[PDB]
Scaffold this active site. Structure first.
Site, PDB file in Angstrom:
ATOM      1  N   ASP A   1       0.825  -1.178   0.000  1.00  0.00           N
ATOM      2  CA  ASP A   1       0.000   0.000   0.000  1.00  0.00           C
ATOM      3  C   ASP A   1       0.875   1.250   0.000  1.00  0.00           C
ATOM      4  O   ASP A   1       2.011   1.202  -0.459  1.00  0.00           O
ATOM      5  CB  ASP A   1      -0.965  -0.081   1.219  1.00  0.00           C
TER       6      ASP A   1
ATOM      7  N   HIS B   1      -3.973   6.003   3.452  1.00  0.00           N
ATOM      8  CA  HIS B   1      -4.672   4.799   3.046  1.00  0.00           C
ATOM      9  C   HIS B   1      -4.062   3.540   3.655  1.00  0.00           C
ATOM     10  O   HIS B   1      -4.784   2.730   4.229  1.00  0.00           O
ATOM     11  CB  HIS B   1      -4.570   4.731   1.524  1.00  0.00           C
TER      12      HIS B   1
ATOM     13  N   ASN C   1     -13.988  -0.029  -6.969  1.00  0.00           N
ATOM     14  CA  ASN C   1     -15.035   0.888  -6.535  1.00  0.00           C
ATOM     15  C   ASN C   1     -15.831   1.534  -7.672  1.00  0.00           C
ATOM     16  O   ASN C   1     -16.541   2.538  -7.444  1.00  0.00           O
ATOM     17  CB  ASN C   1     -14.449   1.993  -5.656  1.00  0.00           C
TER      18      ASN C   1
ATOM     19  N   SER D   1     -11.217  -1.145  -0.562  1.00  0.00           N
ATOM     20  CA  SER D   1      -9.920  -1.155   0.126  1.00  0.00           C
ATOM     21  C   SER D   1     -10.074  -1.454   1.592  1.00  0.00           C
ATOM     22  O   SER D   1      -9.155  -2.026   2.162  1.00  0.00           O
ATOM     23  CB  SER D   1      -9.240   0.195   0.016  1.00  0.00           C
TER      24      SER D   1
END
Ligand SMILES: [Ca+2]
Ligand SMILES: [Ca+2]
Lengths: 10, 269
Positions: free
Chosen positions: B32, B62, B153, B215
């Site tokens: 990430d 994130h 998404n 996520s």
């Protein structure tokens, strides 16, 4: 490209 | 005082914790934007493959948020992860802007396989395939890593890459009523779903934030895999994957929800 914040290649 | 986020309760992680299953001894790589040091996280190590960002600290937020869903510590502050004793490794493959290259992601996957990670969380995706990415997922799988990835998404009925590759477990997002979140990608290849709306977790600056997305769903499943691995240390990545699916709560069509809602209690009983 991408989902929200993460993209990678188109 | 410590709060238990709705999603952690929904996947029934506390029941697993009551059995002594916390993910102890299980190595989980978070591929990430990094993981920032935080009072409610213990980071065991990691590496960065992003040019210009040599540290594993998170300049985006994130990665830190994803990490806390997996493993926020069981203590008297903050939140609580699905696998609060998992050994978290920060593998920085995306920069502070949130973007990365296929080369950096593949380097992260190779690192995970070379360094004994049992689970790799990929809360990232692209609408386009890449042979490099496919090979890296397959290589990591052959080295024993369970690759868990977000479905995406866009709200469409096909899923993002790398989740769409056979050897990646693909995770979609539900809301508080166990409905598919409107943004959650679905379709062929979807394995399972988990909470991905209004997910409270750790965030840089020693704070907490509520975010939405696939996520955020993904780390619930990565955390559940760590619980299964602690209970069954001889089990392989694919055995763990199927067990999570077989014990999931069916929600209806496998096209919309895969095997259903991950259930940490059922998976560890
Ligand atoms: Ca805590
Ligand atoms: Ca897949």
């Amino acid at each position: 490209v991408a989902l929200x914040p993460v993209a990678l290649x188109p | 005082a410590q709060s238990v986020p709705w999603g952690i309760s929904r996947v029934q992680a506390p029941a697993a914790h009551n059995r002594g299953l916390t993910g102890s001894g299980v190595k989980v790589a978070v591929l990430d934007t990094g993981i920032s040091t935080h009072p409610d996280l213990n980071i065991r190590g990691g590496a960065s493959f992003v040019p210009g960002e040599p540290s594993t600290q998170d300049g985006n937020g994130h990665g830190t948020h994803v990490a806390g869903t997996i493993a926020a510590l069981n203590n008297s502050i903050g939140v609580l992860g699905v696998a609060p004793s998992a050994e978290l490794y920060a593998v920085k493959v995306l920069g502070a802007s949130g973007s990365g290259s296929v080369s950096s992601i593949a380097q992260g996957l190779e690192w995970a396989g070379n360094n004994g990670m049992h689970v790799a969380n990929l809360s990232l995706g692209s609408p386009s395939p890449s042979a490099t990415l496919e090979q890296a997922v397959n290589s990591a799988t052959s080295r024993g890593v369970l690759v868990v990835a977000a479905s995406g998404n866009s709200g469409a009925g096909s899923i993002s890459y790398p989740a769409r590759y056979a050897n990646a477990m693909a995770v979609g997002a539900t809301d508080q009523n166990n409905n598919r979140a409107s943004f959650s990608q679905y379709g062929a290849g979807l394995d399972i779903v988990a909470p991905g709306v209004n997910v409270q977790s750790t965030y840089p600056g020693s704070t907490y934030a509520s975010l939405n997305g696939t996520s955020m769903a993904t780390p619930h499943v990565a955390g559940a895999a760590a619980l299964v691995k602690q209970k069954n240390p001889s089990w392989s990545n694919v055995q763990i994957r199927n067990h999570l699916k077989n014990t999931a709560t069916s929600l209806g069509s496998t096209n919309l929800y895969g095997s259903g809602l991950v259930n940490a209690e059922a998976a560890t009983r």
